[PDB]
Amino acid sequence: AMDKAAVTWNANQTYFVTNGTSTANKIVVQALTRPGDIVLIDRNCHKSHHYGLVLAGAYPMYLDAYPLPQYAIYGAVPLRTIKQALLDLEAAGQLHRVRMLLLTNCTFDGVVYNPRRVMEEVLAIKPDICFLWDEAWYAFATAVPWARQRTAMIAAERLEQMLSTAEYAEEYRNWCASMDGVDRSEWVDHRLLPDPNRARVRVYATHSTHKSLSALRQASMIHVRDQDFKALTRDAFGEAFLTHTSTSPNQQLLASLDLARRQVDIEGFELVRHVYNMALVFRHRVRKDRLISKWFRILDESDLVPDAFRSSGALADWNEAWRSDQFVLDPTRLTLFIGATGMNGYDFREKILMERFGIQINKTSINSVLLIFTIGVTWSSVHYLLDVLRRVAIDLDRSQKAASGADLALHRRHVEEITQDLPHLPDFSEFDLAFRPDDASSFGDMRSAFYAGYEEADREYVQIGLAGRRLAEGKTLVSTTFVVPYPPGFPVLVPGQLVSKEIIYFLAQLDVKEIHGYNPDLGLSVFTQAALARMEAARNAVATVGAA
Amino acid sequence: PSYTRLDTWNLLDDACRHLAEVDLAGLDTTHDVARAKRLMDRIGAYERYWLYPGAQNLATFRAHLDSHSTVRLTEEVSLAVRLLSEYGDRTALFDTSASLAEQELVAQAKQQQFYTVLLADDSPATAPDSLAECLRQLRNPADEVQFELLVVASIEDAITAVALNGEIQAAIIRHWVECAEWIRELRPHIDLYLLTVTDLHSTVLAGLRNRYATPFFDALRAIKTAMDKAAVTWNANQTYFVTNGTSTANKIVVQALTRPGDIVLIDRNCHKSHHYGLVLAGAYPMYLDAYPLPQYAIYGAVPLRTIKQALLDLEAAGQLHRVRMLLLTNCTFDGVVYNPRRVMEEVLAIKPDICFLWDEAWYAFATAVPWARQRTAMIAAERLEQMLSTAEYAEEYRNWCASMDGVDRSEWVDHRLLPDPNRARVRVYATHSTHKSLSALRQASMIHVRDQDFKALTRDAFGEAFLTHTSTSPNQQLLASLDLARRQVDIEGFELVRHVYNMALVFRHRVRKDRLISKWFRILDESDLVPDAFRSAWRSDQFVLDPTRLTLFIGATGMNGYDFREKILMERFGIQINKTSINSVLLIFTIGVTWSSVHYLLDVLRRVAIDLDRSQKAASGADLALHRRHVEEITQDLPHLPDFSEFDLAFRPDDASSFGDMRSAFYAGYEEADREYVQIGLAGRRLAEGKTLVSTTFVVPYPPGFPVLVPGQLVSKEIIYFLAQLDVKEIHGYNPDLGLSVFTQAALARMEAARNAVATVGAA
Amino acid sequence: IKTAMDKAAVTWNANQTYFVTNGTSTANKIVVQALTRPGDIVLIDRNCHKSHHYGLVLAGAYPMYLDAYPLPQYAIYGAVPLRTIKQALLDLEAAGQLHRVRMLLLTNCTFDGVVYNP
């Protein structure tokens, strides 16, 4: 059963967690990370990963993604940034503590990573690191042939076979020969290769797809492909699984689930390609259609992916770009653009899109709406979407023709405000000193800050208007808890983070009332000045004691 | 030959590769250019048959060849021959210039076969007006079966192209005597649609889909949020839910919009629930007659001539102010589909502030077509509103208003009319039945409103009408009841409205194709149900049939009516057959239909045809004569249908006009001393003597579903004959053993005397 | 099936029992319409289910509203005393309208619990 499921998912052993994706994420985090062990985590990950880090006392290192101010979304973390962090640790000396790289494959926006490239280029600096790939959005992608190679399991298998080839031995020898005489700190600007002997590939992936058919509600899976599973984590994994789940899901449920798996796997494989066909057809139609294309543009990989990260009979070219290029864009997550019509995506969602085949929306940015085609999308779903877009375009064209000078000017104003200038996307701020084990590095203790907020005496509530003045007055505004706006996970503030002008501004402009850990009427919890001074003094004394 | 075309194209690609190779160096390549010219001219002979390279691409390549640029030319030739080898003619849809990997991927992941349609047209094809451009236009990429238009300017060209091009499965010829026969013999699977317009796209695409040969057997077979979502789902300004059923929704909207003393233009063949709503609300029902089809013995729809005539007749008698409602079923039981935009546009010219109740219970598959959704009440209301909101239409009306100046109102029955933008209001209401197509609990319904004065005029009235006939909050349970139906309809079997629509078209084509089936049976179309007078594109035609509601013509088959259906069709079919006339049986397609159901229908029809032919050969002279008379009996000797007869003068508030008082007739019949029973056998004799037979009850033969007689209706001889002939056991409000309820002559005299006295006194 | 309906009638000791599968208000209105005609006065306890009031409005009946004896201490309405019904039926007789009345239309057990003596 385990062998059949692993072969179906190309993994080595696949474990089912019948408690949701968050439970599996926390299980893997606990199994891998121990207290102290630093972890590199994409700041946009699901909140369950941040909580799993807090439970295991890992020091999070945050990899921020490149912004897209025009569309007000975050694309992904450039591999150069991962290298720069892994080498900035080396200067401080903490690079031995790094234990995991935890990036969300196929980010919610829909930018897709290249797992093989990232693992090859990170295993050169840390040949014993571990990789957890959050594939909540990419689980379907495995079925299609040209997107299969961008999954964690396939990339890991290829990296495993490639590393153990004498041809790769000579390739690495030549690369090293061409490398000598170059400062190790300069490895960020040069392509890197893993060491065929020292590097041990280790990959963990979390899916959710099999819940759809013949499986329990919110059931999630964990694929494991680790050379040293039986040696360093076969017991920690079981204990973590017990800690967040009962014993039965790991094996007893697993055999039955495999019996279900045989039927579901064939049905999913045959039906998933159909959805990608619809995504491609619809994307092509939105542009070719003379009437839709005037007002509606589906953002293309040339648009969300800055050329700096791009390597640019087009089928072979397409396959090569999807196999070798850094960032590509999944067809099945359409980032439709509204900016031409001058109406923010909230109005489009409220009025235009009410009928829905399968599923047709999960996000509404300032000047766009994200549309997703799931297993429920059929041919009529494309027809309906094209028809509604066509009617909207016809109405807008009629209004333009009948629009006077004043009406055209007002429409231009509407387009201008949503388009062009937009509030700057805030980036991760430095952890507070009292929550950073060493100044030289930029990781912090998120667990100490997590519980240090329980002390009502230390914590206080501050208002946005007064928060601006306090920041202008030099008072550090350190958060005391996670703040999680509408987009899944992506906590704008995490325990101990330093609130910055960008952070204050972003929150003030918000309108969504689904902000966990935030009380708009009262304020946002921030550590008091005295408490922060006390913790910083304690940390300084602790550091000084070692030198004594 | 197709095979040599691939070999010749590959050879041309090789020659052009060699030409580019030699020219890159910089030598004199005049010989290679001559070889390329020779090979391209050799190709040009046969490329009128295939579609992708065809003429335009090869001409462009030749234009490059003249310009002496071998790089771009060889690149283009190589690309073209590449796509030509795999996708065949399919790449005619591609847009090579733009992104090509996406389009190539879709092609490899096949969804259903691609087909070529020949268009033998001598007219210029570059004009927009020309059919070739028009037919290519309006195709939807969503359909899993796509096609592209190939044109040939000569008949011999068409024959030659079809004889060798295997991608052709549809030929459209223009006026040819022997061309159709020759093509039909060349390949029997081709559809030779005869020369002529816009329905061509639907009838060609159905034949294409049928070509997929889905049955391959030969040896074997051969609270507010829910309302807001539905409001925009159905183009309705607002939308309310009804749990009891369609009849309750009819009663609700009727009560909310009809007051006592108000006339209600109404289709006589509408559901009995509307008649009872009129009885309860005390409104005077003026009944409009639908054009008859004596050949098939069934009613059609209400021509707009009749509606305008009735409105202007009231205008003549000063009773127009009373009228506040028009009640027409938008999809008649037989199938005929009204044009809402035209009916509401003309009528609002005569009665600017009228209300419309389009009973769309049967119009379930209105959303299975993107242009026929303009034939629903809600979309038509939206379009009419926006049109009336435009100053362009204000100018169009002003030009229209001046031309008609100097024309008497009585002549307006002829001229096409335009609403007055300054005063006309849109007040449309509608109802769609749930269980008939939507998958929810038993007998749910919905109401849709696009009314410019709902809040100011008919909000409280609607609230009271809801509190009556359903003393609950149906806005709670039915939201979840119907949300399941939309999810089931939208996804299961794709959009079930699309699947069954396509299945109905495929079945129509297959019936039209099979020789035995079409030998006796037939499917009636716009050229049958709709008269020539009332057929004047979809935006212009008044009546268009609904493909899903089929009327199979058993008349030529014979075997009578109500016995062949009972003894064969419902034994195994199961899928609904809601009606049966003497010669035409109305086949109905429901959501549960499957391709297997379609082939079971074609198998039972084929078996009946084969048994009929077995009798024909075995039939002797006596059998042949009996069969000929039986077929002739129910094809020509069909008694005329019972057109509505004016309300008796005792029940008509205005003797000049033709609208009665159905409430008073309803209650006046409750009495036992005013009601009499007269046997049908003596009704004709009693009429001959000169008595006025006025019925007291609703006589509603069930299978038709519509009231032959209403209280206060002047029983006429045609109605007597129709009732005598019809002997279906389900006849509400009538019985053939006691008699036909009729007001006693003394009662009628007293009532008419009282009515005359009241009218005289009120006028004074 | 008809025999079964007879069994139901035996169960309820009625002559013919008819089942209305659209709520109790539908059956109330059905009976009101079947019995009352326009004009025909109908006595009715003012506390009756509002479905009866709507049925009377639909059928055009002229309703004579009988009132129940109050209970100010508990702020409820008990029932209409038989003396009141007779007083109304005789007050009509003075005006000559008594022939018109067709339905007493009393509730059998008021909301609070009081039970009439049919």
- Which residues make Cβ contacts (< 8 Å) with residue B306, sequence separation at least 6? B288, B289
Q: Is A239 exposed, middle or buried (0-12, 13-18, 19+ CB in 10 A)?
A: exposed
- Three-state SS across B89-109? HHHHCCCCCCCCHHHHHHHHC
Q: Nearest Cβ partner of A357 from B232, B391, B491?
A: B491
- Which residues make Cβ contacts (< 8 Å) with residue A204, sequence separation at least 6? A28, A32, A130, A131, A132, A133, A152, A222, A223, A224, A225, A226
Q: Are C55 and C33 in contact (CB under 8 A)?
A: yes
Chain B residues touching residue A284 (CB < 8 angstroms): 99, 102-103, 106
Q: Are B686 and B678 in contact (CB under 8 A)?
A: yes
Q: Nearest Cβ partner of C38 from B470, B472, B667?
A: B667
Q: Do A379 and B144 touch (CB under 8 A)?
A: yes
Q: Is C1 exposed, middle or buried (0-12, 13-18, 19+ CB in 10 A)?
A: exposed
AA identity, residue C99:
H
Q: Do B667 and C23 touch (CB under 8 A)?
A: no
- Our CA-based measurement puts residue B50 at a distance from the nearest CA of chain A, in whole angstroms, of 22
Per-residue CA distances from B224 to B240, B252, B427, B449 (Å):
10, 20, 22, 15
Q: Is A20 exposed, middle or buried (0-12, 13-18, 19+ CB in 10 A)?
A: middle
| DSSP bridge pairs for B451 | B427
Q: Do C54 and B471 touch (CB under 8 A)?
A: yes
Give the residue on B whose Cα is nearest the Cα of A144: B109
DSSP single-letter state for residue B709: B
Per-residue CA distances from B408 to B233, B356, B635, B689, C81 (Å):
44, 26, 44, 43, 69
Q: Which two tokens stand for residue B492?
A: 């299961």
Q: If residue A107 lies in a helix (H) or strand (E), which one and from where to where?
A: none
Q: Give the integer Cα–Cα distance in Å for B54 and B118.
A: 13
- Which residues make Cβ contacts (< 8 Å) with residue B389, sequence separation at least 6? none
Chain A residues touching residue B106 (CB < 8 angstroms): 277, 280-281, 284
- Which residues of chain B approach chain C closer than 8 Å at the C-beta? 244, 280, 467-468, 470-472, 667, 670
The stretches of B155-271 forming alpha helices (DSSP H) are 155-164, 179-186, 200-211, 224-233, 246-257
Phi, psi of B122 (to 5 degrees): -85, -15
- Our CA-based measurement puts residue B123 at a distance from the nearest CA of chain A, in whole angstroms, of 26
Chain B residues touching residue A269 (CB < 8 angstroms): none
Give the residue on C whose Cα is nearest the Cα of B245: C22
Phi, psi of B212 (to 5 degrees): -60, -10
What is the β-pairing status of strands B355-359 and B427-433?
A: parallel
Q: Which two tokens stand for residue B585?
A: 């049986």
Per-residue CA distances from C106 to B90, B121, B164, C43, C49 (Å):
79, 82, 88, 8, 10
Q: If residue A382 lies in a helix (H) or strand (E), which one and from where to where?
A: helix A379-402
Q: Do A314 and B101 touch (CB under 8 A)?
A: yes
Whose CA is closest to A12, among A253, A238, A186, A204? A204
- Which residues of chain C approach chain B closer than 8 Å at the C-beta? 22-23, 25, 37-38, 50-51, 54, 57-58
Using CA of residue B667, residue B670, residue B673, residue B674, what is the dihedral sign? positive
- Three-state SS across B12-42? HHHHHHHHHHHHHHCCCCHHHHHHHHHHHHH
Q: Do A285 and B141 touch (CB under 8 A)?
A: yes
Q: Do B105 and A280 touch (CB under 8 A)?
A: yes
Q: Give the integer Cα–Cα distance in Å for A367 and A297.
A: 11
Contacts of A among chains (3+ CB pairs under 8 A): B
Give the residue on B whose Cα is nearest the Cα of C54: B468
Q: Which two tokens stand for residue C38?
A: 């326009």
Q: Are A72 and A418 in contact (CB under 8 A)?
A: no
Using CA of residue A182, residue A184, residue A185, residue A187, what is the dihedral sign? positive
* Cα torsion through A285, A291, A292, A293, rounded to 10: 80
DSSP single-letter state for residue B695: B
Whose CA is closest to B214, among B507, B591, B546? B507
Q: Do B141 and A313 touch (CB under 8 A)?
A: no
Q: Give the integer Cα–Cα distance in Å for C50 and C34.
A: 18
Q: Which two tokens stand for residue A245?
A: 């789940």
Angle between helical axes of B200-211 and B496-513 (0-180°, round to 10): 90
AA identity, residue A157:
E
Give the residue on B whose Cα is nearest the Cα of A383: B142
Q: What is the resolution of this structure in A?
A: 3.4
Q: Is B2 exposed, middle or buried (0-12, 13-18, 19+ CB in 10 A)?
A: middle
- Which residues make Cβ contacts (< 8 Å) with residue B320, sequence separation at least 6? B311, B314, B350, B351
Q: Is B547 exposed, middle or buried (0-12, 13-18, 19+ CB in 10 A)?
A: buried
Q: Nearest Cβ partner of B233 from A288, A355, A378?
A: A355
- Which residues of chain A approach chain B closer than 8 Å at the C-beta? 146, 273-274, 276-277, 280-281, 283-285, 287-288, 313-315, 317-318, 331, 351, 354-358, 376, 378-380, 382-383, 386-387, 402
Contacts of B among chains (3+ CB pairs under 8 A): A, C
Q: Give the integer Cα–Cα distance in Å for B411 and B408.
A: 6
- Which residues make Cβ contacts (< 8 Å) with residue A376, sequence separation at least 6? A357, A358, A359, B491
Q: Give the integer Cα–Cα distance in Å for A467 and A455.
A: 21
AA identity, residue C108:
N
Q: Do C54 and B468 touch (CB under 8 A)?
A: yes
Q: Which two tokens stand for residue A400?
A: 């333009």
Say how many C-beta atoms besides its own lie within 10 A of residue B316's C-beta: 13
Give the residue on C whose Cα is nearest the Cα of B276: C58
Three-state SS at A180: coil
When scoring C20, C21, C25, C36 by the number of chain B Cβ atoms within 10 A, the one with the most, hence best to mutate, is C25
Q: Do C51 and B471 touch (CB under 8 A)?
A: yes
Q: Do B472 and C23 touch (CB under 8 A)?
A: yes
AA identity, residue B755:
R
Q: Do B471 and C50 touch (CB under 8 A)?
A: yes
Whether chains B and C touch (3+ CB pairs under 8 A) is answered by: yes
**What is the CA angle A46-A494-A137, rounded to 5?**
10
Give the residue on B whose Cα is nearest the Cα of C57: B280
What is the β-pairing status of strands B284-288 and B263-267?
A: parallel
Give the residue on C whose Cα is nearest the Cα of B244: C22
Q: Give the integer Cα–Cα distance in Å for A60 and B46.
A: 70
Three-state SS at A236: helix
Q: Give the integer Cα–Cα distance in Å for B505 and B202.
A: 8
DSSP single-letter state for residue A375: T
Q: Nearest Cβ partner of B102 from A273, A283, A378?
A: A283
Q: Do C25 and B471 touch (CB under 8 A)?
A: yes
Q: Give the integer Cα–Cα distance in Å for B607 and B88.
A: 40
Q: Give the integer Cα–Cα distance in Å for B284 and B660.
A: 6
Q: Nearest Cβ partner of B491 from A273, A313, A378?
A: A378
Q: Give the integer Cα–Cα distance in Å for A188 and A177.
A: 18
Longest dimension (CA), chain A: 82
Q: Nearest Cβ partner of B232 from A276, A287, A354?
A: A354
Chain A residues touching residue B109 (CB < 8 angstroms): 273-274, 276-277
Q: Give the integer Cα–Cα distance in Å for A102 and A104.
A: 7
Whether chains B and A touch (3+ CB pairs under 8 A) is answered by: yes
Q: Nearest Cβ partner of B370 from A378, A387, A402?
A: A387
Per-residue CA distances from B382 to A231, B238, B341, B426, B540 (Å):
70, 12, 10, 9, 18
Contacts of C among chains (3+ CB pairs under 8 A): B
Q: If residue A181 lies in a helix (H) or strand (E), which one and from where to where?
A: none
DSSP single-letter state for residue A66: P
Chain B residues touching residue A280 (CB < 8 angstroms): 102-103, 105-106
- Which residues of chain B approach chain A closer than 8 Å at the C-beta? 79, 82, 95, 98-106, 109, 111, 140-144, 228-229, 231-233, 370, 390-392, 490-491, 494-495, 498
Total length of chain A: 548
Q: Are B182 and B160 in contact (CB under 8 A)?
A: no
- Our CA-based measurement puts residue B282 at a distance from the nearest CA of chain C, in whole angstroms, of 9
When scoring B477, B667, B672 by the number of chain C Cβ atoms within 10 A, the one with the most, hence best to mutate, is B667
Q: Which two tokens stand for residue B301?
A: 């729809």
Give the residue on C whose Cα is nearest the Cα of B255: C58
Q: Do B468 and C38 touch (CB under 8 A)?
A: no
Per-residue CA distances from A439 to A91, A309, A434, A446, A543 (Å):
12, 31, 10, 15, 11
Angle between helical axes of B680-689 and B717-725 (0-180°, round to 10): 170
AA identity, residue B547:
P
Whose CA is closest to B211, among B473, B505, B617, B606? B505
DSSP single-letter state for residue B649: G
Q: Give the integer Cα–Cα distance in Å for C87 and A294.
A: 81
- Our CA-based measurement puts residue B53 at a distance from the nearest CA of chain A, in whole angstroms, of 17
